[PDB]
Automatic annotation (TrEMBL):
List of glycosylated residues: N213, N554, N589
Gene3D superfamilies registered for this protein in UniProt: 1.50.10.10, Maltose phosphorylase, domain 3
Entry protein name: Alpha-L-rhamnosidase
Species this protein is from: Aspergillus niger
EC number(s) from the headed UniProt entry: 3.2.1.40
Enzyme class: hydrolase
Keyword vocabulary terms for this entry: Glycosidase, Hydrolase, Signal
Gene Ontology MF term list: alpha-L-rhamnosidase activity
Tagged with keyword Hydrolase: yes
Pfam families tied to this protein: Bac_rhamnosid6H (PF17389), Bac_rhamnosid_C (PF17390)
Coiled coil feature spans: none
Length: 630
């Protein structure tokens, strides 16, 4: 396994805290609970906050060697961010109030106390052991069984990335570990058990809803929600594919979502047991997820199984396209952003992307009948979207035909999809989006004074696709170095969202501690750095066809790789002064692909010796194997 040192995931599922952060009261040998030899003696009312170093998850067990009064109690509290360390409560999961400590009456006697997976804590970095009674207790250990990525070898990555920019490397591996943390045992889902409260009052919590079929599944957030969400998949899937390659949790998630499709084709806002809600964009995201799951797995059986449902969902989306040629949205539910309605640039951009995905899929399946309608509809969406929604003055798309707001999501998606009329226009959008950056990242005005890493990943893809890799690297540094290195963060996983002023306030949530610090949809940098900076782009099922387009920017060394069922993809180059010194790549045998290197002239040689001339920095029909530039 390459670059194992960067993999954050624990080397054992039997975890003890790494270090002692704080001792309140009189506690002997607190470090005993960190693996150091000995026992920890809590003498009366006391507490100790321990730090795991990384975000972890699982079931706590308290090994009591001794207790005094039959009324002795040891509590355990958990939190992701250091902001919420308390001897009286955990961080929050519900729309209001903090969650209660797990209270183990150690007064009954010695032994190991635990409440099992019903009280799984999905994410926490700091753990507080609390002695709230005057009694003296002696504890041999307080440990956790790590229950994330439940059926995987945690450090057996199949993908890797390593650049000359160490901050980027750490961002990549933090995103991978975030995704590992969001993959859970499906029987421990739904942290929103409650679907007004002050610190004295604590909220009961439990994880005992089976959200999907199978033995593993990828949810939106480790601590919460622990439901399946289609929108997050639009980043989570590709970031999983190039790192752990645990597409099984993605598949169970997607299958659970499709099991809930309605007779009109409408796909769910979220998996069970969330309220039945109509969301144009999230139905579309279910379609995007199916398409990209086929793209990376190449599972023809699975695609055949679900093609009828996919076409029904496409038709449900197309039922909204009106006389204008654009979709007229009547469902405000989206990524928790406001103002979702009417002729949204984001909805129609996702729709264009979806229609092109569907055309590609139907050509792969030789289902030519729906192709003409889909192609014509997509072309009309493009035309009328640029006629009615393009603001040439401000260089952005507006949210709809009757507003002055230019959204980050809509413009990002309009660049990611080929909705722009020209490459020049994509460049204008990239520049205008970058001009809005604040001291803490890219803003999403459609959701108020919010910075959304979710939308930040799509902005990254836009910047890369406009010809601005270094703009995207600057956004990576500015935003994700904040999410990684801010002292309030976790330094291992990525946050769900925050505010433009640098506060961890997330506008839709009044309960600030319920903001989860481990969300898969914030892992855009992993797939972005692998696909765009390193240049390894799958363009066919499981990599049957591919495209090598490294966009190094001002990077001097870049090495990356991942795997599919066809074989191993690898990229490696070193530059200086705007010229490649070395460039090599590997693709699975039997595949054919193309290369776009830029203002690079010379010849590519195969392992056999086949020589191909770069014409405009390009090449075509290239067989699979180890190729090098001379
Ligand atoms: C600390 O936490 C860890 C979390 O990982 C616990 O370990 C896990 O325990 C579960 C218990 O079932 C194991 O699940 C089983 O996994 C089988 C495949 O295992 C794969 O991963 C291994 C990783 O090393 C690997 O070595 C192995 O070769 C293989 O690749 C899987 O075939 C089993 O299938 C059962 O479940 C299917 C899903 O439906 C069921 O879902 C729940 C599961 O909880 C169940 O309650 C429900 O009733 C459903 O039946 C089902 O379709 C099948 O018919 C079959 O019943 C099963 O999922 C998991 O592998 C363990 N992971 C690791 C890494 O060990 C660990 O136990 C815990 N500590 C303690 C002390 O308990
Ligand atoms: C996940 O965990 C939650 C708890 O955190 C759990 O919810 C609890 O479920 C139990 C059932 O397993 C509930 O207990 C029942 O509540 C009903 C309604 O109050 C009562 O009628 C039940 O009485 C039983 O016994 C009676 C005779 O004494 C019978 O007449 C009657 O028919 C019943 O057989 C029993 O008290 C409990 O109220 C809830 N609590 C909460 C807070 O939800 C949930 O079931 C778990 N989900 C799983 C495991 O899938
Ligand atoms: C065309 O696009 C325009 C630009 O997006 C749309 O106008 C937007 O409409 C929305 C919805 O009214 C406004 O959203 C704002 O939301 C905040 C917060 O409200 C939310 O949160 C509070 C709690 O804080 C909760 O109580 C609410 O129920 C919401 O869930 C409010 O403070 C604002 O007053 C407002 O409601 C946008 O501000 C608004 N933008 C602009 C520029 O007008 C327009 O709706 C679209 N066209 C159509 C036909 O829908
Ligand atoms: C240390 O913490 C434990 C765990 O919370 C405490 O045990 C708890 O004691 C309270 C006492 O009121 C119990 O609350 C409930 O009170 C109502 C009356 O308002 C009563 O009807 C309920 O039956 C219950 O007694 C709570 O259930 C109990 N928790 C457990 C798990 O037993 C303990 O008292 C604390 N010790 C000190 C010294 O603070
Ligand atoms: C081919 O694709 C087009 C989309 O470009 C589909 O046309 C659209 O179909 C929906 C219903 O599926 C129409 O919505 C309906 O509009 C009428 C008004 O005429 C309204 O009374 C209904 O209640 C409903 O809202 C939509 O207007 C229509 N748009 C256009 C431009 O035709 C068409 O269904 C697809 N055909 C096939 C065979 O897939
Ligand atoms: C993304 O969209 C751009 C346009 O916004 C596409 O480039 C355009 O491609 C069309 C054809 O797909 C060109 O229009 C026509 O091409 C035919 C040949 O097929 C020619 O006979 C006509 O005279 C006309 O030129 C158009 O010139 C071209 N424009 C530019 C600026 O490139 C691009 O292909 C799209 N990319 C993807 C991946 O979909
Ligand atoms: C936040 O995370 C970073 C890593 O992403 C932590 O910094 C890292 O700290 C380790 C030590 O725990 C450094 O490696 C060690 O170097 C020592 C020599 O001093 C050696 O004996 C060890 O075997 C190990 O190689 C690592 O270089 C360093 N990396 C960076 C980029 O700082 C940091 O401690 C974390 N901070 C918090 C508050 O969690
Ligand atoms: C140990 O006591 C300290 C107080 O010195 C606790 O820290 C406080 O935490 C609250 C949040 O619950 C903050 O609002 C306060 O600002 C903190 N105190 C100070 C002086 O800044 C800490 O939570 C306690 N830790 C344990 C494990 O009991
Ligand atoms: C887009 O959809 C909206 C509803 O989501 C339509 O709004 C209605 O338009 C009719 C026009 O005759 C008005 O009489 C109604 O009062 C409008 N609704 C409301 C709640 O006021 C709108 O017409 C649609 N536009 C297009 C072009 O299809
Ligand atoms: C649109 C979705 O919003 C969030 O889902 C939640 C739904 C309800 C509540 N709640 O009311 O507790 C909290 C979160 C979550 O970020 C998902 O990733 C995102 O796709
Ligand atoms: C998983 O599937 C079984 C039957 O195969 C079903 O009983 C169970 O409810 C399912 N769990 C879900 C859909 O979360
Ligand atoms: C590196 O940054 C400089 C700006 O200092 C820019 O001019 C140059 O184009 C960048 N290099 C590449 C390969 O884009």
């Amino acid at each position: 396994v390459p670059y194992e040192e960067y993999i954050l995931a624990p080397s054992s599922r039997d975890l003890a805290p790494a270090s002692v952060r704080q001792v309140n009261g009189s506690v002997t040998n607190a470090a005993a609970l960190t693996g150091a030899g000995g026992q920890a003696t809590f003498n009366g009312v006391s507490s100790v906050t321990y730090d795991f170093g990384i975000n972890v998850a699982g079931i706590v067990s308290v090994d009591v060697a001794s207790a005094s009064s039959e009324s002795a109690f040891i509590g355990v509290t958990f939190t992701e961010s250091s902001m919420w360390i308390s001897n009286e409560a955990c961080d929050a999961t519900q729309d209001a109030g903090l969650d209660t400590p797990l209270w183990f009456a150690v007064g009954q006697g010695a032994g190991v106390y635990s409440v099992g997976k019903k009280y799984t804590r999905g994410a926490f970095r700091y753990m507080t052991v609390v002695s709230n009674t005057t009694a003296t207790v002696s504890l041999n250990s307080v440990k956790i069984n790590y229950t994330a990525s439940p059926i995987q070898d945690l450090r057996a990555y199949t993908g890797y990335f390593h650049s000359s920019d160490e901050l980027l490397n750490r961002i990549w591996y933090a995103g991978a570990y975030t995704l590992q943390l969001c993959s859970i045992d499906p029987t421990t889902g739904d942290a929103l058990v409650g679907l007004t409260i002050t610190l004295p009052q604590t909220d009961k919590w439990w994880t005992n809803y089976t959200i999907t079929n199978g033995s593993s599944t990828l949810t939106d957030g480790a601590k919460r929600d622990r439901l399946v969400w289609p929108g997050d998949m639009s980043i989570a899937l590709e970031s999983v594919a190039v790192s752990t390659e645990d597409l099984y949790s993605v598949r169970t998630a997607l299958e659970s979502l499709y099991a809930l499709q309605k007779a009109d084709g409408q796909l769910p806002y979220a998996g069970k047991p969330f309220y039945d809600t109509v969301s144009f964009t999230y139905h579309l995201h279910s379609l995007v997820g199916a398409a990209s799951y086929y793209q990376y797995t190449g599972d023809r059986a699975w695609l055949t199984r679900y093609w009828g449902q996919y076409k029904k969902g496409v038709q449900w989306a197309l039922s909204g396209v009106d006389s204008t040629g654009l979709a007229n949205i009547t469902a405000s539910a989206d990524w928790l952003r406001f103002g979702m309605g009417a002729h949204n640039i984001e909805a129609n951009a996702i729709l264009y992307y979806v229609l092109n995905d569907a055309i590609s899929l139907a050509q792969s399946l030789n289902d030519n009948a729906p192709i003409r309608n889909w192609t014509a509809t997509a072309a009309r969406i493009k035309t009328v979207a640029n006629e009615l929604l393009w603001d040439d003055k401000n260089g952005l798309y507006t949210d709809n035909e009757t507003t002055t707001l230019h959204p980050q999501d809509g413009n990002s998606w309009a660049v990611k999809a080929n909705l722009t009329l020209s490459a020049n226009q994509s460049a204008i959008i990239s520049e205008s989006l970058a001009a809005r950056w604040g001291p803490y990242g890219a803003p999403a005005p459609e959701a108020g004074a919010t910075v959304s890493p979710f939308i930040g990943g799509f902005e990254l893809q836009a910047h890369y696709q406009a010809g601005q890799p270094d703009r995207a690297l600057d956004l990576l540094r500015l935003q994700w170095g904040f999410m990684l290195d801010d002292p309030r963060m976790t330094n291992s996983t990525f946050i769900e969202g925050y505010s433009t002023d640098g506060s961890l306030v997330y506008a839709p949530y009044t309960n600030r501690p319920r903001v989860s610090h481990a969300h898969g949809w914030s892992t855009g940098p992993t797939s972005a750095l692998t696909i765009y900076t390193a240049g390894l782009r799958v363009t066919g099922p499981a990599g049957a066809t591919w495209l090598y387009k490294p966009q190094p920017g001002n990077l001097t060394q870049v090495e990356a790789g991942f795997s599919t069922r066809l074989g191993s993809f690898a990229s490696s180059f070193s530059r200086s002064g705007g010229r490649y010194q070395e460039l090599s790549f590997t693709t699975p045998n039997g595949t054919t692909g193309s290369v776009e290197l830029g203002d690079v002239s010379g010849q590519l040689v195969s392992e056999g010796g086949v020589k191909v001339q770069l014409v405009g920095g390009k090449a075509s029909g290239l067989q699979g194997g180890k190729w090098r530039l001379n």
